[model samples]
Target: MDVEPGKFYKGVVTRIEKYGAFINLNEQVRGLLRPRDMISLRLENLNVGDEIIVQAIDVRPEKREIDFKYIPLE
Candidate 1:
């Protein structure tokens, strides 16, 4: 999907690392949700294919780089 900063989108957990989680926003778009942005949840408990909501804090479409943060549902 086409992403821009200051907007929210639905994403799936595609990969996880010690530093952060990689989110697949859509078939054509992916982004990183860093550990600092996931303060409310435990990254260790997250798994691939899990769906989550995230906000685009920054975007670099030219490089296909996006910075994401979790958006609490409640």
Candidate 2:
């Protein structure tokens, strides 16, 4: 798995939760888009199955979690 940070990747909004949204960066990479609650407001537009651009902010292999920022498609 490529667990590098500061890289942008295409991801699918797979699922959303009260805390954050589940994202698929690739078949082998997945992460959570955070800054929740308020971000959840922005995340309203992030529906399941929607494709979005995301940047990897952090990666915690111990937790198998990635911290990401959603980027607007350009």
Candidate 3:
């Protein structure tokens, strides 16, 4: 997937962890959504395999790293 910073994408909740949540946008596009960036979304309400929309605030193509934030449903 060719994800870019500042773009929004629909993704699946792949995993939940203490550090952050994992979002799988596609086979090649996955990113980390930190707890601090979760906003109004409750961790308990999120389940693996659920779909969510997120914004890519940061992307590292060279390192294959990324940062994401949960977007409001509206």
Candidate 4:
């Protein structure tokens, strides 16, 4: 799947790391949610298999570097 910056998508947490959580945009594509990207929720509260909304602030398909910001929970 291809992703573009400035777009919002529903993502699922695939894994958690000390720095951030890996979120899957689709079956294959994944994005990184860093500590600074979160709005109000704690990163430690996020666990694998959790679902959340994310905004694609940056996407680099060539280098496989995708950055995401947490969508404010509503």
Candidate 5:
């Protein structure tokens, strides 16, 4: 089943690579989180077991990718 969009889902930071961070969701699938979006927010800030809430904005199951889309409320 496709997860609902524009909703918050708990995820864990599985790995932090030079390119970006990886969030582990259900089913052993991981999502790429780019630092460009959150600069100065070192990956180290997020532990491997760190569970954080994320919003799934854009998803391309064919590509096995889910854009961690987030926005600030005015």
Candidate 6:
């Protein structure tokens, strides 16, 4: 797909792991909800079944992975 950067995507949480979680961007595909740009939402606990809005910062399909930076709110 041609997903652009600097855009917010409303996705669903498909799977959660120790490092990060996987979010379904669309269709049967998904992206890794990494721990970048999450400094504001920092907490001592992390669990599954949590939903969030993320911005697509970097898209590198060559390595079959996507990179992102958190968008902080004031």
Top TM-score prediction, candidate number: 4
- List ranges where model 5 is wrong by over 4 Å: 39-41, 70-74
> For every model shown, what is its TM-score relative to the native structure?
0.87, 0.76, 0.85, 0.88, 0.69, 0.64
| Model 1 misplaced regions, further than 4 Å | none
Count of steric clashes across candidates, in order: 0, 0, 0, 0, 0, 1
Q: After superposition, how far is residue 63 of candidate 6 from its true place, in Å?
A: 3.1
lDDT of 4 by residue, 16-71 (tens): 99999988887668888998988876688998998888889888867676888886
Instruction: Report the number of backbone clashes for model 2.
Output: 0
Candidate that would win on lDDT: 4
Angstrom error at residue 25, model 3 = 0.9
Tens digit per residue, CA lDDT, model 5, 1-74:
35555656767787778876788767845677666555335665766777666677666777786766423420
Model 3, total clashes: 0
Candidate lDDT values, in order: 0.82, 0.72, 0.81, 0.84, 0.65, 0.60
**Residue pairs clashing, model 6:** 37-70
For model 3, the run of ten residues with the poorest summed lDDT: 65-74
Better of 3 and 5 by TM-score: 3
Residue ranges of candidate 3 with Cα displaced over 4 Å: none
Instruction: Decide which is better by TM-score, 2 or 3.
Output: 3
lDDT of 6 by residue, 1-74 (tens): 45666777755666666666666666744667667556565322434555566787777676555554445642
In the range 23-74, model 3's lDDT, one tens digit per residue, is 8887877788887788778667788988777788989988686898877752
* lDDT, candidate 2, 1-74, per-residue tens: 47588876777888887677888876767888764422323675668998766778887878877888755433
TM-score: model 1 vs. ground truth? 0.87
Q: How displaced is residue 48 in candidate 4, in Å?
A: 0.4
Error of 3 at 2 (Å): 1.4
